[PDB]
Amino acid sequence: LHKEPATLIKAIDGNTVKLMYKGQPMVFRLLLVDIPKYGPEAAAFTKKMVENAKKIEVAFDKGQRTDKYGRGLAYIYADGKMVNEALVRQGLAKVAYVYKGNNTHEQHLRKAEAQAKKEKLNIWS
């Protein structure tokens, strides 16, 4: 998948952020990440990862690129590290059902989730 540059504009929550993409603002929903008392923790985690980053990148998958609410559906990277995966591995989010063919990192995410589950981390306490 192609990683494209972006600039953080504003953190919203665990799996949602506003970014400057291709010369304009756009809300992005992190692909394959679902947020089920960890809502604030997830929000804080993502916020910190993207604000302290010296580089943000977005990578669209092979399926539909935006949901019905107009948000871009992608894998977000902070300093080369995928936020989507970090959240799941930290047990702050579960892996969501694949949406419109966007499943490139599903397996990689299910593994991270399994490990988080094995570790009884946060949501898996």
UniProtKB/Swiss-Prot annotation:
Portion held of the full protein: 89 to 223 of 231
Residues covered by region (Disordered): 105-125
Disulfide links within the chain: none
Basic and acidic residues biased stretches: 105-121
Binding-site residues, Ca(2+): 15, 34-35
Localization in the cell: Secreted
Species: Staphylococcus aureus
Domain of life: Bacteria
Active site: 29, 71
Protein name (database record): Nuclease A
